[PDB]
Amino acid sequence: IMTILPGMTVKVTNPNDTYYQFQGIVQRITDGKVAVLFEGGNWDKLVTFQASELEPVVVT
Amino acid sequence: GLLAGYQFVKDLESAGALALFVPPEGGFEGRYQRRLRSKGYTTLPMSAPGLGDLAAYLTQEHGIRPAHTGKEDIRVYFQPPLVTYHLENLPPNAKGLVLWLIDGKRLSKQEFAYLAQLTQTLPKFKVVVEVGGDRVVRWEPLADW
Amino acid sequence: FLNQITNYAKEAVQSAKYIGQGLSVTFDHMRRRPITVQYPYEKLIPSERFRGRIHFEFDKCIACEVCVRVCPINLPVVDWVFNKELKKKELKHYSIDFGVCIFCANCVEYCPTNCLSVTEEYELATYDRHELNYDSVAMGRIPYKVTQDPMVTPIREFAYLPAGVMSGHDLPAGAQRAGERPEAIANTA
Amino acid sequence: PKIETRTEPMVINMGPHHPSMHGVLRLMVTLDGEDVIDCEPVIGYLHRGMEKIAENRTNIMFIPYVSRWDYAAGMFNEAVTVNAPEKLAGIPVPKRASYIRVIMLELNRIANHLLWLGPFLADVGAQTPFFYIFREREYIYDLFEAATGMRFINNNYFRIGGVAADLTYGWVTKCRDFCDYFLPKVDEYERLITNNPIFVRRLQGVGKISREEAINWGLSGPMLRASGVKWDLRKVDHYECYDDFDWDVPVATEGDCLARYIVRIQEMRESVKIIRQALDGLPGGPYENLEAKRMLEGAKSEWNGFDYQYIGKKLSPTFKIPKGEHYVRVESGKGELGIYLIGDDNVFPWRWKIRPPDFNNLQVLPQLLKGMKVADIVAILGSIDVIMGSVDR
Amino acid sequence: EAGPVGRLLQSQNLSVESLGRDASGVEMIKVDRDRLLAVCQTLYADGFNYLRCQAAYDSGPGQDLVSTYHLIKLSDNADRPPEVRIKVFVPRDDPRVPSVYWIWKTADWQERESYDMFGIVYEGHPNLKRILMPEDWVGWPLRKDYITPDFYELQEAY
Amino acid sequence: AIKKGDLVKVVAEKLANSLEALASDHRYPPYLFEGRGEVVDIRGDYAQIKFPVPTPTVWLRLDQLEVA
Amino acid sequence: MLLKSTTRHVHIYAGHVVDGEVHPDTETLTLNVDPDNELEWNEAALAKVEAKFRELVANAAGEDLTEYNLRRIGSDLEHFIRSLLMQGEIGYNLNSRVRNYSLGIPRVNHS
Amino acid sequence: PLADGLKLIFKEDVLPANSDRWLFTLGPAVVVIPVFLSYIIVPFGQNLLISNLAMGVFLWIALSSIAPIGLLMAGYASNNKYSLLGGLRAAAQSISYEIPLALAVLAVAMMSNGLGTVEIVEQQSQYGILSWNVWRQPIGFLVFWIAAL
Amino acid sequence: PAILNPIARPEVPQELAENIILTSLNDVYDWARLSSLWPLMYGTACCFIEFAAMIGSRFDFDRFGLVPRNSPRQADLIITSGTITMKMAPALVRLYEQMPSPKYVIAMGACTITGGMFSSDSYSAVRGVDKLIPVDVYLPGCPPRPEAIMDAIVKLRKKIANEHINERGNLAQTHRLFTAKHKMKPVPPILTGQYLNAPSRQAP
Ligand code: SF4
Ligand code: SF4
């Protein structure tokens, strides 16, 4: 109940990845793999990550 | 090169639901499907991500609602339950029905547990969900996951 | 008059030198590293805009039909019954046939609730065509992540290779896209 | 074995199953001994009916359709399909959207000439750089996949207000890298044909369309420029801020396959110059710098101005194509891709005629196969740059 | 009304109309078909040497078929040639235009396309065949009142 | 009489010798003659009918239809 | 020039077959119901399809011998074959190699 | 290659629509039997061959001249054109290079005083690499190589 | 009937290959037809270019075993890489019928699955290639990227490795051969091959 909830804002911290420093919106949580929604761009992208490479932000 | 016997059918009859680990380059596990079909089973090879809510698609009636391309109406099509319609429309002396799911990836753990319990409850129904990956064709029971 | 005999031998030896030169420079093509993206073990990463399989969230849907009226073939079958106990639209069984879909994500842009998102998933091959009718729980699944498969060495294609790199095969350890991001010039200037 | 041997001229089918990248057309040629006497081209094996589909589609849902005529340079089709309600309603585009349009269209011209160039060198007999041309075409594919989302065709990139989305964070750098990589390749492609006497023997005087006969037959693009006419629609029509650069239209005086080859190679060499001169004069530069300048300098100071936007008033899907008619055009990879739009204040057009760039260049193909041999058929068909999705549409 | 080719070139016993102008500044002319081969010929002897977009449309589901001709003065350089458009309105019960193939040969295949899509019979040009539909097809698919038959291939995917 | 959204069917004897019959075959398909063609647009004496077959819409006269 | 209408489940082939060759005849046309065996075809529904085909080729008297009319006959026979499959008189094969349901999925009658 | 062999064993017959059914099956056989039969001539060492065959390379040339009969047989026995034309084209190509092959072999038969390949190699295996015929036939090797390609 | 488009009960068909030698020879047979898989060089539309992007160097076509063939007689596979019109459909059924019997079809792109964006307002587009040909693997994506095509080829290989060698007999045609006499008028060949020599190009 304390773990990563859907509906908030995130930002990726996995450095050796195509998606880096990207802020996203977490949309669905099944089996640990977290799928976040990226508003950046005209088409909204859904890219799957895991909890070992994500951390929520405090500013927004 | 790996002359495989019929141990695969014995692990299928033992576990009831086994997860396959196929090399991702193509057809190196279909020899086991043909061994399984030669022992009297009827394999039903279909793609797992096209199924949704396997409690409803496999054993329940489900409205398909095909694509109207701006021309027809909604026009719901009530597909029969796949496992029970393919099990009742079978020879009565057959070995059973086997659901051969070719994409075990992009599925949840809950659907794996449901598939294993579904193979355990009704008597002649086995699944060979292909979660993929491994360098050789190797299979586990669908016990832990 | 041997002006056309020596010209004949000159054309012959010029063609022979051309064949020898082209044979020397096609022998310098074998030493180059092959650019083959070896698919089942080297699945190349799609870009941050790819427009693969459409993802749908059954709870974020106000049951309008904007995703149908902007789709080029009016494809998504959204059907609702109005519940006068609550007086909202109350969607039931949204679905998209991905054998008919042309993957333009018009329905993704013109979605007022950001319900429809698009994924990086393209391996959608099926044996039966009617299995491409993804209903609301089928297309509400988490997509296949190419960088999280323990059999694939994923490859950035060309627009994510840093500033001098043409092919993503010689990449040492996850070097980023081109350079700085808009959180750098705000700190610079 | 009921094949007899007559003295009358035979008939060669060359039917719709072409075992190369030649499209779907029949080429029923007679060719008595070797001289091609007659040539009936059968057309319409990809006629899917875009002109009747268009009358039942909104322009926001006909943009995914328009990549399928010239499906090697797809966005050129969007470059008329967007520009047809743009000039009825008078919707202005931003300067940044216009420069992004110029960059996308010149990359599409490079890719279209590369996909012409592969099969043309394979038909003329070179057949070594067929596998080396698809590499730079894949570079253009991966450039399009970052910005537009898809590869060479299925882009929804062009919109009535400009461009659907601005460029990514590393796009300008990698496009400059591709141009620095691609400047010597066009010189290599020119020296492959012109510094080899067997190829220029295969391409000299093969198809002898005149200057005035090219104007009479309605030829356009590199088939018109190779006959002698300096007619580029980017220069004739002051189109989409193409006059802010310094490029010269390539022409030749003969009109044969070698002249068309030279015009297309020099069109690649001029389009990459237009790419460089547009990347330099991009309003705000790359998107990372422009987004940073509109982030740190408040919400003001001309970087939030109109001509520094990617979209000029992103429109509702129920946009009415207003009452009135005109005829827009672009100079695509084959030249004069035109749209005759007669929209009548409906959400749909009333008539959407497609003037294809190579449907009017394929009618000269029986005229160009008059005094030619058998093995010079596929060269001449190679020199037209025919793509049957535009010919049939 | 007006028009820089009606008041300039059409006062040599040709008797044309003037529909106005386009939204791109192109001047339109309505021409009765019986003197089309006259009025195009004086436009070929004027400088309009390039025929682009020999189109055709319906102008209403029961009204007259139209066959349009978008002429232009293709010179050797830039800056906006005069670019006139001709329109020929033909009745639907007898659609029949004298072909302009012997003036501009560009209408060899564009008149075949407009005949294949609308049934406008072009008199004079050599091949009047279906160019896009199958050559044994019945009907004209780009008319507004085209009842397309229920072939099994044209039905839904089932 | 006939408005936008009415499921109309085509009267064959009214259609058989019109100028609407010049555009197509004289061997009319049976999707016209079932009450499932929906009127989507009326532009004066003619209506645009969308039939449930996945083929383009037909513009027929208003007196060639009847509300099923 | 052989006139034919080859789609799935019907082949028209205006002409007669001799050994494995169809020779183009003017005043006859053959019929090849389901050449790939997606359906089962008991003899009652097979005779029904044969009678419907002879009625269709009798009603098509007086028209041209184009491929358009052959395609019309084949499409009407396709709609009849799909109507027999939808009525339940014809089943899917299930011994075939493809099993792709080209005339609709199985579905229950009402709900 | 082995799968590309084995798959072609598994595929069916086609018989193109009025094919000869005797000349059709014999065309490939007539074009590949003398090429296999010409492997008597090749040595892998002194007496490491099937037979010496005093007319060795001349018999190889004579047997290779049977190829544009299986070519014309495969061209004729198909009832379609473009393969009869292709068969005549391949037979006109295959007889245009028999005579330069024969002349280039004739130069080596001059320099070797015979036609058997054991005697042809034995007149080169005297000084190892200096007695090879490519240094004494610099253009005959080119004529043989281009004519054999 | 209570099931609208029903499946039918088989005749209890089983091979029951208890032999392990013939099972391994069946494995060799399926591997050999699996790892060769020579497709027809068949195009017709947009998707073919992505198919050509497999034959190039960035994605490799050959590394699954498959080299493209010009003639359908040497073709083991057909990837229907584009829209099938009403004009192209008999030509496509002809070039599928001209292949040897262990043949495979991949419906590439949305135009051959269902006739994707032409499944609404087109009068000359076959809505799906399975209205003409038995299809093995369906391949979505309007231009399916070449990784998706050699994913469809991977699923086709998974399909091929299941095929039994005793089950050959599904490769049949099963003639029915109902012949009827008709009373239609023969028309002359409208399209003959006379384009410039026709006596209407010379003078009006
Ligand atoms: S547009 Fe979005 S919110 Fe509206 S119905 Fe479609 S998916 Fe739901
Ligand atoms: S992606 Fe395009 S084609 Fe697919 S459902 Fe959305 S709008 Fe329709």
Ligand code: SF4
């Ligand atoms: S599916 Fe899309 S890309 Fe493929 S042929 Fe059809 S329109 Fe072209």
